[PDB]
Design a protein around this ligand. Sequence first.
Ligand SMILES: CN(C)CCOP(=O)(O)OP(=O)(O)O
Ligand SMILES: [Mg+2]
Ligand SMILES: [Mn+2]
Length: 176
Amino acid sequence: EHVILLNAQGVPTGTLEKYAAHTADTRLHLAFSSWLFNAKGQLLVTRRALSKKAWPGVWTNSVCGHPQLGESNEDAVIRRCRYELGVEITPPESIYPDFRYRATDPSGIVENEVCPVFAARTTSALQINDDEVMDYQWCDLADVLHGIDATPWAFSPWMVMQATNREARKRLSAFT
Ligand SMILES: CN(C)CCOP(=O)(O)OP(=O)(O)O
Ligand SMILES: [Mg+2]
Ligand SMILES: [Mn+2]
Protein backbone atom coordinates (compact mmCIF):
# COMPACT_ATOMS: atom_id res chain seq x y z
CA GLU A 1 0.00 0.00 0.00
CA HIS A 2 0.84 3.62 -0.68
CA VAL A 3 -0.57 7.08 -0.30
CA ILE A 4 -0.92 9.60 -3.09
CA LEU A 5 1.04 12.75 -2.36
CA LEU A 6 -0.33 16.17 -3.14
CA ASN A 7 0.89 19.78 -3.31
CA ALA A 8 -0.72 22.88 -1.78
CA GLN A 9 -2.94 23.14 -4.84
CA GLY A 10 -4.18 19.48 -4.39
CA VAL A 11 -2.22 18.25 -7.43
CA PRO A 12 -0.76 14.66 -7.20
CA THR A 13 3.11 14.83 -6.99
CA GLY A 14 3.82 11.07 -6.56
CA THR A 15 3.31 8.32 -4.00
CA LEU A 16 4.96 6.98 -0.79
CA GLU A 17 4.66 3.63 1.00
CA LYS A 18 1.66 4.03 3.40
CA TYR A 19 3.27 3.08 6.77
CA ALA A 20 6.47 5.10 6.03
CA ALA A 21 4.48 8.14 4.88
CA HIS A 22 3.01 8.76 8.42
CA THR A 23 5.56 10.39 10.66
CA ALA A 24 6.28 13.45 12.73
CA ASP A 25 6.02 15.45 9.54
CA THR A 26 3.61 13.67 7.28
CA ARG A 27 3.49 15.21 3.78
CA LEU A 28 0.03 16.16 2.48
CA HIS A 29 -1.74 13.21 0.88
CA LEU A 30 -4.99 11.60 -0.32
CA ALA A 31 -7.37 9.92 2.23
CA PHE A 32 -11.20 9.40 2.65
CA SER A 33 -13.62 9.11 5.59
CA SER A 34 -16.96 7.39 5.50
CA TRP A 35 -19.86 7.43 7.96
CA LEU A 36 -21.74 4.10 7.79
CA PHE A 37 -25.40 3.82 8.80
CA ASN A 38 -27.55 0.67 9.42
CA ALA A 39 -31.20 0.05 8.30
CA LYS A 40 -32.35 1.72 11.52
CA GLY A 41 -30.33 4.94 10.71
CA GLN A 42 -27.81 4.31 13.47
CA LEU A 43 -24.21 5.38 12.92
CA LEU A 44 -21.41 2.84 13.22
CA VAL A 45 -18.71 4.28 15.50
CA THR A 46 -15.48 2.34 15.63
CA ARG A 47 -12.50 2.18 17.96
CA ARG A 48 -9.30 1.71 15.97
CA ALA A 49 -7.11 -1.33 16.98
CA LEU A 50 -4.15 -0.86 19.38
CA SER A 51 -1.89 -1.93 16.54
CA LYS A 52 -2.75 1.12 14.36
CA LYS A 53 0.25 3.34 13.96
CA ALA A 54 -1.66 6.59 14.10
CA TRP A 55 -4.34 7.18 16.82
CA PRO A 56 -4.39 3.59 18.07
CA GLY A 57 -7.19 2.73 20.54
CA VAL A 58 -9.14 5.84 19.42
CA TRP A 59 -12.88 6.26 18.83
CA THR A 60 -13.73 7.41 15.35
CA ASN A 61 -16.23 7.40 12.41
CA SER A 62 -16.94 4.12 10.67
CA VAL A 63 -14.23 3.64 8.08
CA CYS A 64 -11.34 5.73 6.87
CA GLY A 65 -8.43 4.95 4.60
CA HIS A 66 -6.15 5.96 1.74
CA PRO A 67 -7.09 5.54 -1.97
CA GLN A 68 -4.42 3.80 -4.15
CA LEU A 69 -3.26 4.72 -7.73
CA GLY A 70 -6.06 4.20 -10.26
CA GLU A 71 -8.80 3.80 -7.60
CA SER A 72 -11.74 6.21 -7.22
CA ASN A 73 -12.49 7.50 -3.69
CA GLU A 74 -15.75 5.58 -3.70
CA ASP A 75 -14.03 2.28 -4.52
CA ALA A 76 -11.56 2.99 -1.75
CA VAL A 77 -14.59 3.30 0.67
CA ILE A 78 -16.03 -0.05 -0.57
CA ARG A 79 -12.67 -1.91 -0.35
CA ARG A 80 -11.95 -0.72 3.24
CA CYS A 81 -15.51 -1.52 4.44
CA ARG A 82 -15.00 -5.11 3.23
CA TYR A 83 -11.49 -5.24 4.48
CA GLU A 84 -12.06 -3.64 7.96
CA LEU A 85 -15.63 -4.51 8.76
CA GLY A 86 -16.51 -7.43 6.50
CA VAL A 87 -19.46 -5.43 5.23
CA GLU A 88 -21.25 -4.50 2.00
CA ILE A 89 -22.53 -0.96 1.49
CA THR A 90 -24.68 1.19 -0.74
CA PRO A 91 -22.82 3.55 -3.25
CA PRO A 92 -20.94 6.06 -1.06
CA GLU A 93 -22.47 9.56 -1.09
CA SER A 94 -20.42 12.77 -0.92
CA ILE A 95 -20.81 14.65 2.33
CA TYR A 96 -17.75 16.99 2.64
CA PRO A 97 -15.65 16.86 -0.61
CA ASP A 98 -13.22 19.65 0.33
CA PHE A 99 -12.19 18.47 3.91
CA ARG A 100 -8.48 18.80 4.52
CA TYR A 101 -6.82 18.79 7.96
CA ARG A 102 -3.48 18.23 9.69
CA ALA A 103 -3.18 16.80 13.22
CA THR A 104 -0.74 15.20 15.70
CA ASP A 105 -1.42 12.06 17.66
CA PRO A 106 -0.38 11.46 21.34
CA SER A 107 2.91 9.91 20.29
CA GLY A 108 3.45 12.70 17.65
CA ILE A 109 2.49 10.94 14.41
CA VAL A 110 0.91 13.49 12.07
CA GLU A 111 -1.95 12.99 9.66
CA ASN A 112 -1.84 15.55 6.86
CA GLU A 113 -4.66 14.84 4.47
CA VAL A 114 -6.91 16.04 1.72
CA CYS A 115 -9.73 13.90 3.04
CA PRO A 116 -13.08 13.76 1.16
CA VAL A 117 -15.95 12.46 3.39
CA PHE A 118 -18.66 9.96 2.32
CA ALA A 119 -21.74 8.27 3.81
CA ALA A 120 -23.35 4.90 3.00
CA ARG A 121 -25.71 2.31 4.41
CA THR A 122 -24.58 -1.18 5.31
CA THR A 123 -26.30 -4.00 3.50
CA SER A 124 -24.86 -7.09 5.24
CA ALA A 125 -23.79 -8.10 8.76
CA LEU A 126 -20.48 -6.89 10.15
CA GLN A 127 -17.66 -9.33 10.34
CA ILE A 128 -15.00 -7.46 12.26
CA ASN A 129 -11.33 -7.52 11.38
CA ASP A 130 -9.67 -7.10 14.76
CA ASP A 131 -6.39 -5.97 13.21
CA GLU A 132 -8.27 -2.77 12.36
CA VAL A 133 -11.13 -2.44 14.78
CA MET A 134 -11.06 -3.24 18.50
CA ASP A 135 -14.57 -2.05 19.49
CA TYR A 136 -17.70 -0.67 17.84
CA GLN A 137 -21.02 0.73 18.66
CA TRP A 138 -24.33 1.40 16.79
CA CYS A 139 -25.83 4.61 17.87
CA ASP A 140 -27.95 7.70 17.40
CA LEU A 141 -26.19 10.32 15.27
CA ALA A 142 -27.39 13.17 17.61
CA ASP A 143 -25.92 11.38 20.68
CA VAL A 144 -22.57 11.15 18.86
CA LEU A 145 -22.59 14.85 17.73
CA HIS A 146 -23.35 15.80 21.41
CA GLY A 147 -20.38 13.69 22.69
CA ILE A 148 -18.24 15.25 20.00
CA ASP A 149 -19.30 18.90 20.96
CA ALA A 150 -18.90 18.12 24.70
CA THR A 151 -15.81 15.98 24.79
CA PRO A 152 -13.93 16.34 21.42
CA TRP A 153 -10.74 14.93 22.81
CA ALA A 154 -12.53 11.62 23.27
CA PHE A 155 -12.69 11.09 19.42
CA SER A 156 -10.27 11.30 16.43
CA PRO A 157 -9.41 14.82 15.29
CA TRP A 158 -10.78 14.19 11.79
CA MET A 159 -14.08 12.95 13.19
CA VAL A 160 -14.54 16.06 15.39
CA MET A 161 -13.50 18.50 12.55
CA GLN A 162 -15.73 16.67 10.03
CA ALA A 163 -18.74 16.68 12.40
CA THR A 164 -18.14 20.25 13.38
CA ASN A 165 -18.49 21.62 9.84
CA ARG A 166 -21.99 23.23 9.64
CA GLU A 167 -22.80 21.78 6.18
CA ALA A 168 -21.14 18.40 6.74
CA ARG A 169 -23.27 18.00 9.95
CA LYS A 170 -26.44 19.03 8.09
CA ARG A 171 -25.78 16.44 5.25
CA LEU A 172 -25.01 13.62 7.76
CA SER A 173 -28.34 14.36 9.48
CA ALA A 174 -30.29 14.49 6.23
CA PHE A 175 -28.56 11.21 5.26
CA THR A 176 -30.08 9.31 8.30
C1 LIG B 1 -8.64 10.03 8.12
N1 LIG B 1 -7.41 9.29 7.80
C2 LIG B 1 -6.81 8.80 9.05
C3 LIG B 1 -7.57 8.42 6.60
C4 LIG B 1 -7.56 6.91 6.96
O1 LIG B 1 -6.79 6.55 8.15
P1 LIG B 1 -6.36 5.04 8.59
O2 LIG B 1 -5.34 5.26 9.63
O3 LIG B 1 -7.64 4.26 8.87
O4 LIG B 1 -5.73 4.38 7.26
P2 LIG B 1 -5.60 2.83 6.77
O5 LIG B 1 -6.89 2.06 6.99
O6 LIG B 1 -5.24 2.92 5.27
O7 LIG B 1 -4.44 2.39 7.58
MG1 LIG C 1 -8.87 2.54 8.11
MN1 LIG D 1 -2.96 9.41 6.10
